[PDB]
Amino acid sequence: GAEEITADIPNVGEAALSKLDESGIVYIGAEVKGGDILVGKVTPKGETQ
C-alpha cells in the first residue's frame, strides 16, 4: 500500500504526540530531544507468523 504521514502511530502514547499537529508533523518552535517524533509515518506490513 501507500505509506501515510499521520499522527495515528501504534504503540505510542499521547506523551510523544504532544509536539505533533493533526497532520502528524512537528510544530515550528518545538523543543525536541533524542528519540522524539518529528514526522509520524506508518508503513503497511504483511502477514506475520
Partner: protein
C-alpha cells in the same frame, strides 16, 4: 599574648561606583591576611546568591532563531542582552515576573521595564534592543529567579508552551575579586596587617552582605573540622 589572636573587624567600606567597592578588614595577624583573603576570594567568586533572567515570552515569537519586524536585533541577540540584566528581588521571593512594552523608534533599555515594586533594576541604561520603525512595537514578559551559580537551560530538569524561551542563568553577582595585605598601624605593634578586598559586581549585592555571607559559608564548612569525629 601568644595563644590568643586579634579578631579582624570591618573598619571601612568604600563605594567607588555602583559596581565597584573596597572593603577593609583590620587587624589581622601575620599570615592570616593571605589565608582569609584567599578563602574569601574563592567563596565569593563561586557561591554567592543572586537573581537572573530565566524565561522570556515575546509576543509573536516562536523561537530564538527568528526576526521581528521593526527590531534591528534578532531574538537571540535580545536574549543575550537580557542575560546582562542586573535585578535585585526583595527578600522572600525566589521568582518574579516583569514586563517590557515599548512602541516607536529608539533604543529599548532596562529603564522601560514595568515592575511591581519588589524588583529593582540596577542598570537602567542597559540596552536590550532597538526599534527602527515608528510602527514597531515590542512586548516581552520576563521571568527572574533567585539562585546560585551557573544553571544552563539544558541542565534544567524537564509542559512548556511554544513561545517560552529559556535563558542560561548566571546567578552569581560577583564578577571580579582582588585582595591585598598591607601594613596596619595599630597601637604599638608592627606585626599586624590590613586586608583590602576589591569587589567588582553587577550592583545587586552589597559589599558587607557579601563578606558576611562568605564568612558564614566558611564557618559552617569549618564546623565539621571543629567537631572532628567518624560519621
Amino acid at each position: 599574648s601568644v595563644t590568643e589572636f586579634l579578631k579582624p573587624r570591618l573598619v571601612d567600606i568604600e563605594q567607588i561606583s555602583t559596581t565597584h567597592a573596597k572593603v577593609t578588614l583590620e587587624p589581622l595577624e601575620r599570615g592570616f591576611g593571605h589565608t582569609l583573603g584567599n578563602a574569601l576570594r574563592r567563596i565569593l567568586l563561586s557561591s554567592m546568591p543572586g537573581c537572573a533572567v530565566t524565561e522570556v515570552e515575546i509576543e509573536g515569537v516562536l523561537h530564538e532563531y527568528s526576526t521581528k519586524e521593526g527590531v534591528q536585533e534578532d531574538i537571540l541577540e535580545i536574549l543575550l542582552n537580557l542575560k546582562g540584566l542586573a535585578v535585585r528581588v526583595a527578600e522572600g521571593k525566589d521568582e518574579v515576573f516583569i514586563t517590557l512594552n515599548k512602541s516607536g523608534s529608539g533604543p529599548v533599555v532596562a529603564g522601560d521595564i514595568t515592575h511591581d515594586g519588589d524588583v529593582e533594576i540596577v542598570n537602567p541604561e542597559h540596552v536590550i534592543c532597538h526599534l527602527t520603525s515608528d510602527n514597531a512595537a515590542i512586548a516581552m514578559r520576563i521571568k527572574v529567579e533567585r539562585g546560585r551559580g551557573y544553571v544552563p537551560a539544558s541542565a534544567r530538569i524537564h509542559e512548556r508552551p511554544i513561545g517560552r524561551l529559556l535563558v542560561d542563568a548566571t546567578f552569581s553577582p560577583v564578577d571580579k575579586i582582588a585582595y591585598s595585605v598591607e601594613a596596619a598601624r595599630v597601637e604599638q605593634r608592627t606585626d599586624l596587617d590590613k586586608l583590602v578586598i576589591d569587589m567588582e559586581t553587577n550592583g545587586t549585592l552589597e559589599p558587607e552582605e557579601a563578606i558576611r555571607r562568605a564568612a558564614t559559608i566558611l564557618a559552617e564548612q569549618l564546623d565539621a573540622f571543629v567537631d572532628l569525629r567518624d560519621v
